[PDB]
């Protein structure tokens with residue numbers, strides 16, 4: 707790849723999001739990547755799917771990602787993959803802040819201070835791990851060293 711050639715994908719077509727949401731909703735999915743057709747589908751919990759997705763494609767240009775719960779950890783993986791748009795059903799404040807810093811196009815249904823643990827009474831151990839870390843690449847590296 708030429709370091710002189712940069713793709714700019716900054717908007718998503720509103721009817722593809724519409725279509726992907728219909729699929730996400732109809733299949734109780736937890737993660738979806740969509741290009742006009744469905745290219746990755748998962749319903750597991752936590753980061754396992756985002757990592758599965760990361761391991762599967764170098765990038766997601768021309769595609770959109772839908773995710774149930776987007777924390778800083780998932781934001782980092784997704785940012786590196788360069789999807790056209792990420793739609794988060796719930797996004798945490800750290801994730802939102804990060805995606806703005808990176809000019810990634812994204813939308814959300816609910817915003818929350820931070821992703822929560824199994825209980826719903828405290829912070830997800832992965833979110834706490836990466837909470838005071840700045841760099842998405844450093845974050846991806848540390849998360850992978852748990853899987």
Ligand SMILES: [Zn+2]
Nearest residue numbers: 707708709710
């Ligand atoms: Zn280079």
Ligand SMILES: [Zn+2]
Nearest residue numbers: 709711712713
């Ligand atoms: Zn570039």
Ligand SMILES: [Zn+2]
Nearest residue numbers: 713715767768
């Ligand atoms: Zn491209």
Ligand SMILES: [Zn+2]
Nearest residue numbers: 793794795815
């Ligand atoms: Zn939604």
Ligand SMILES: [Zn+2]
Nearest residue numbers: 804807840841
């Ligand atoms: Zn930063």
Ligand SMILES: [Zn+2]
Nearest residue numbers: 841842843844
């Ligand atoms: Zn970096």
